[PDB]
Design an enzyme around this catalytic site. Structure first.
Site, mmCIF file in Angstrom:
data_model
loop_
_atom_site.group_PDB
_atom_site.id
_atom_site.type_symbol
_atom_site.label_atom_id
_atom_site.label_comp_id
_atom_site.label_asym_id
_atom_site.label_seq_id
_atom_site.Cartn_x
_atom_site.Cartn_y
_atom_site.Cartn_z
ATOM 1 N NE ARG B 80 -3.993 -0.337 1.408
ATOM 2 C CZ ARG B 80 -4.971 -1.140 0.998
ATOM 3 N NH1 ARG B 80 -5.359 -1.130 -0.271
ATOM 4 N NH2 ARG B 80 -5.560 -1.957 1.861
ATOM 5 C CG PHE B 83 -0.424 9.550 -4.076
ATOM 6 C CD1 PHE B 83 -1.350 10.529 -3.769
ATOM 7 C CD2 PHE B 83 0.919 9.823 -3.875
ATOM 8 C CE1 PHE B 83 -0.946 11.756 -3.272
ATOM 9 C CE2 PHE B 83 1.324 11.052 -3.376
ATOM 10 C CZ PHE B 83 0.391 12.015 -3.078
ATOM 11 C CD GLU B 85 -5.449 -1.990 -4.140
ATOM 12 O OE1 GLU B 85 -5.127 -3.169 -4.405
ATOM 13 O OE2 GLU B 85 -6.586 -1.684 -3.722
ATOM 14 C CG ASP B 194 12.172 7.904 1.805
ATOM 15 O OD1 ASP B 194 11.226 7.353 1.198
ATOM 16 O OD2 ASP B 194 12.209 8.011 3.046
ATOM 17 C CE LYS B 196 10.220 4.950 4.053
ATOM 18 N NZ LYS B 196 9.054 5.690 4.613
ATOM 19 C CG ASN B 199 11.581 3.189 0.596
ATOM 20 O OD1 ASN B 199 10.406 2.948 0.327
ATOM 21 N ND2 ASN B 199 11.984 4.366 1.075
ATOM 22 C CG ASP B 212 9.107 4.369 -2.878
ATOM 23 O OD1 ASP B 212 9.800 5.244 -2.320
ATOM 24 O OD2 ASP B 212 7.895 4.532 -3.147
ATOM 25 C CB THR B 233 9.097 8.050 8.371
ATOM 26 O OG1 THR B 233 9.807 8.114 7.135
ATOM 27 C CG2 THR B 233 7.706 7.457 8.134
#
Ligand SMILES: Cc1cncc2cccc(S(=O)(=O)N3CCCNC[C@@H]3C)c12
Ligand SMILES: Cc1cncc2cccc(S(=O)(=O)N3CCCNC[C@@H]3C)c12
Lengths: 400, 398
Positions: B80, B83, B85, B194, B196, B199, B212, B233
């Protein structure tokens, strides 16, 4: 299948006649950017972002696509109702063409036709020695452009004005027109505007039909249903002139009526239905039975008079009704210098003498420049004035 | 340049996948203009009415031949996003299995955020790296954007950390694979911003790939980027990016390495180094990292692991990684006797997944049920343009 679909799609991207080929798709984007780049619409976020997103890309596109400044103008040689026609030389290829211009703003300003499609389609695909060939067609935000072959011989009006045409010549040019119209008919068209103004000679002196702004497609019965009259006052036929809402349903016989008017003028010297005014010609045409008279002069052979009369009569009796072959069989054409199937291979009555690739002697002087013509008004909201002229371009997907 | 050249340069642009005027992008612009004009209020204008009437039979057929949503058979929802799923799908014709991502167009416009998908689409499609998840196809309609990617059956690193007490040997492997994955993304000219576990995904062999890339940016002349955004986050977000609230800040790529230090810390200790209950409390602990960064009273973590976590969790100007990626690789924490950097992704992974079929989704937890009905666009009275930000997204592969 997953391949049949990828294939069918690739056809619609290449075929020179696809409504969405590379020429049409590159136009559609070029139209949008042009019809959005206005400060009153730049206030909208999506539009402002889109133009700034494609700014560098779209200026590269227009520099690579065929544009107006690619051609070097040599001299203005013709004036159309919507734009001039000029003899140009392509700066890179050094090739010489006759380029026609069409003001977008003018045609949109009341010209109920969108006629340019029919002429673009014929000149580009006709592939006939009797039809003037379209090589390229492109556009911008102001005019449409039609790059055609240059006809150095000039029109038949200029020939008739500087010569007293003898029957031998008249027979040649009438016969070349008959084959030229039969070729246009075979494509499924009625010309509706046959006149010397639309006839041009090549460098050998042979005839071609230039301009097709009034051509329309025939149906299965081979007829045309029209509620408004179309053509030129002198050369227009009785049935096309009286075209009304009550019917307005004529065949291709109207074209042959005009050929008879064309033959009459080449010999007599005047139009068969001349008048003091313009509206007089009208009454003279509707009364062709009593108004059609030859002047007292013995030089028009019996055969010439017979053919002109066989064409200048009511549609139901008019010659050429039962096909084009009964026109060719006429005794006026009976000569001993050429045959129909080899006519455009014989030597022309007047062979033009040319000095260079840009010899424009057979064309009378015009003016050039004129200043600057005003185009569309700067939009307050989204108007979309380029959408009508999308896909007119003939450059990326031409037929070879 | 000649005419034969100018013509051919143009003709190649309609086949070049990287070109913005490629055939699919031009087909988008027409597909789009029909949607953002076919409203009864705009039919009053004849230039529009005539344009739409001509391309009726044509544009209907185009929207039938191109790659559409019903070409795929949905098997199960596996992810999910913000914007939309992400679902495991099988292409009905080719029978191949992919992970398809969905992005609601209306939603991205409503949140004033419809300019991030470009960076991710460009990387996943052209990166051509074993460390990057590959984009095979990308298409669209009037509602969502679609991203057809390779399915990673190994699951994310969050699921691994939750089911294991990760030993150093493992932590060393996964940190090193992230370092190489980020270095490949840097070589393309990007700062990830980003990094983490969410991802990070494992393949069928158990090796790591970055999935991602919705926050990547192009570095300027000095290899840096100036930006201004919010904070999603803040557990892994660096001090410099947090000090860049407004657009007054210029940060380099060393911010990505800070996140790797947070990543290593979590794998060993068990929690994020600057965790707090509220979002503003997490931020306050990041800024005061010189005092908030501590280690538990158990010497389970070795000296080298402590050193590297501290070398990453310090001020940008001293932070390890500033003088290139080679000084990170030379660190003693990585000094092992199992693998070498240049051959790491060829060695056997610490956790190799055991799969039952091409659609084994055991490593992915079941996802609720969105249920929330997607809202639609209201009928316009003028030109809205709610398709222009989504022209040029369509992409095919060979
Ligand atoms: C001079 C000329 C010269 N060469 C090629 C041509 C092709 C089409 C039209 C012309 S044109 O004659 O300029 N022309 C357009 C102006 C309206 N009158 C009809 C006529 C056929 C050409
Ligand atoms: C499950 C999954 C499985 N296979 C391939 C994938 C490719 C991209 C993203 C995902 S995903 O994990 O659905 N995903 C998107 C949701 C937001 N969180 C980040 C994460 C990478 C994949």
């Amino acid at each position: 299948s997953f391949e049949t679909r990828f294939e069918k799609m690739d056809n619609l991207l290449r075929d020179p006649k696809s409504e969405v080929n590379s020429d049409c798709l590159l136009d559609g984007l070029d139209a949008l950017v042009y019809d959005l780049d206005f400060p009153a619409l730049r206030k909208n976020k999506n539009i402002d972002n889109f133009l700034s997103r494609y700014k560098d890309t779209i200026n590269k596109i227009r520099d690579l696509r065929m544009k107006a400044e690619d051609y070097e103008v040599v001299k203005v040689i013709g004036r159309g109702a919507f734009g001039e026609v000029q003899l140009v030389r392509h700066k890179s290829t050094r090739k010489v063409y006759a380029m026609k211009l069409l003001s977008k703003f003018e045609m949109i300003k009341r010209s109920d036709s969108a006629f340019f499609w029919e002429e673009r389609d014929i000149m580009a695909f006709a592939n006939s020695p009797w039809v003037v060939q379209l090589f390229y067609a492109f556009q911008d935000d102001r005019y449409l452009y039609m790059v055609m072959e240059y006809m150095p011989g000039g029109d038949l009006v200029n020939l008739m004005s500087n010569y007293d045409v003898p029957e031998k010549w008249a027979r040649f040019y009438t016969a070349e027109v008959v084959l030229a119209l039969d070729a246009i008919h075979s494509m499924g068209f009625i010309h509706r505007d046959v006149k010397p103004d639309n006839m041009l000679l090549d460098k050998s002196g042979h005839l071609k039909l230039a301009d097709f702004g009034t051509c329309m497609k025939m149906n299965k019965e081979g007829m045309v249903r029209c509620d408004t009259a179309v053509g030129t006052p002198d050369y227009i036929s009785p049935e096309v002139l009286k075209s009304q809402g009550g019917d307005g349903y004529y065949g291709r016989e109207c074209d042959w009526w005009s050929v008879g008017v064309f033959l009459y003028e080449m010999l007599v010297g005047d139009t068969p239905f001349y008048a003091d005014s313009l509206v007089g010609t009208y009454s003279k045409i509707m009364n062709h039975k009593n108004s059609l008279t030859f002047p007292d002069d013995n030089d028009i052979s019996k055969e010439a008079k017979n053919l002109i009369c066989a064409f200048l009569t009511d549609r139901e009796v008019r010659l050429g009704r039962n096909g084009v072959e009964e026109i060719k069989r006429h005794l006026f054409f009976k000569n001993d210098q050429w045959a129909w199937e080899t006519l455009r291979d014989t030597v022309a009555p007047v062979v033009p003498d040319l000095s260079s690739d840009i010899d424009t002697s057979n064309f009378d002087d015009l003016e050039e420049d004129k200043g600057e013509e005003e185009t569309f008004p700067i939009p307050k909201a989204f108007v979309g004035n380029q959408l009508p002229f999308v896909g007119f371009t003939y450059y990326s997907n031409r037929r070879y």
